[PDB]
């Protein structure tokens, strides 16, 4: 996990071993950030977008930094065209897609594209919908933008991107309005975990099936959470960070796809929300 928020934006980069279970620090981020997204390309970990909500500022971030697990260094790469708080990111073929996010009162529909070989950014076609807190998942090398917030309404809609024609296509909407949900692909297709629908945080978790173009519910977690991190590696996806409306939650819940149960596995030293998570 990289970044996060508790009283202020955080520089924490700090891992967890579900095999061991203990918590230990690594190099801090260069600039504290929350509302960012994390992803891997070629083993390296890249923290993307966000903002630094601090006692002396609230600066939306257009930067992104690459970290290497071989040498514990964060190295700045080229920044985007605009800052993106509450961004969503998707990895196809080890390439970086930056989706939506906000800059001040502007809620982006713009999307950008980054190549770790070359280190650049270029604009692609805008989304149908402006989306901050948008969940982004990649499936069969298609880029999906799920839920979010357009500045007035929170969204249950989702849309798909085609890397060959620069066109966005609305698909079937989720059963639940979700902003700040945890969105990832597990096994077959797209999972949508938790989020905020404008009145409550969500523990219900939805799942999309592309062949049937159908969203179907799965067992809900024990504790609600929005602005959570999400990552896949060994199946059995965990949820880390978030917020339920009063306390910056301190639960790591684990959903098993076979028996479809949730149970709290562990906890890091402090509550936290708005993280960018990926695993190498």
């Amino acid at each position: 996990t990289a970044g996060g928020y508790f009283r202020q934006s955080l520089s924490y980069l700090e891992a967890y071993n579900p095999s061991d279970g203990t918590w230990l620090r690594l190099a801090d981020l260069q600039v504290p950030r929350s509302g960012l997204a994390g992803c891997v390309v070629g083993g390296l970990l890249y923290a993307v977008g966000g903002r630094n909500n601090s006692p002396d500022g609230n600066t939306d971030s257009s930067a992104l930094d690459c970290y290497n697990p071989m040498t514990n260094q964060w190295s700045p790469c080229a920044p985007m065209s605009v800052p993106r708080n509450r961004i969503g990111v998707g990895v196809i073929d080890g390439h970086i897609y930056a989706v939506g996010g906000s800059h001040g009162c502007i809620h982006h529909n713009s999307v950008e594209r980054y190549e770790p070989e070359r280190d650049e950014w270029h604009l692609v076609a805008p989304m149908l919908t402006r989306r901050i807190g948008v969940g982004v998942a990649v499936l069969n090398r298609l880029l999906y933008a799920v839920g979010g917030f357009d500045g007035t309404n929170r969204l249950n809609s989702a849309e798909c991107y085609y890397p060959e024609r620069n066109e966005w296509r609305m698909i079937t909407a989720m059963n639940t309005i979700r902003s700040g949900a945890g969105v990832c692909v597990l096994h077959n297709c797209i999972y949508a975990a938790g989020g905020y629908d404008g009145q409550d945080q969500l523990n219900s978790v939805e799942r999309y099936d592309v062949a049937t173009a159908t969203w179907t519910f799965v067992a809900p977690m024990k504790h609600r959470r929005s602005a959570l991190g999400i990552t896949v590696h060994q199946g059995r996806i965990y949820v880390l960070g978030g917020y339920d409306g009063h306390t910056f939650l301190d639960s790591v819940e684990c959903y098993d796809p076979d028996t479809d149960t949730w149970s709290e596995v562990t906890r890091m030293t402090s509550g936290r929300s708005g993280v960018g998570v990926a695993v190498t």
Partner: peptide
């Protein structure tokens, strides 16, 4: 503070 992520105004 803010309902979705808990960050301050």
């Amino acid at each position: 503070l803010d309902e979705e992520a808990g960050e301050f105004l």
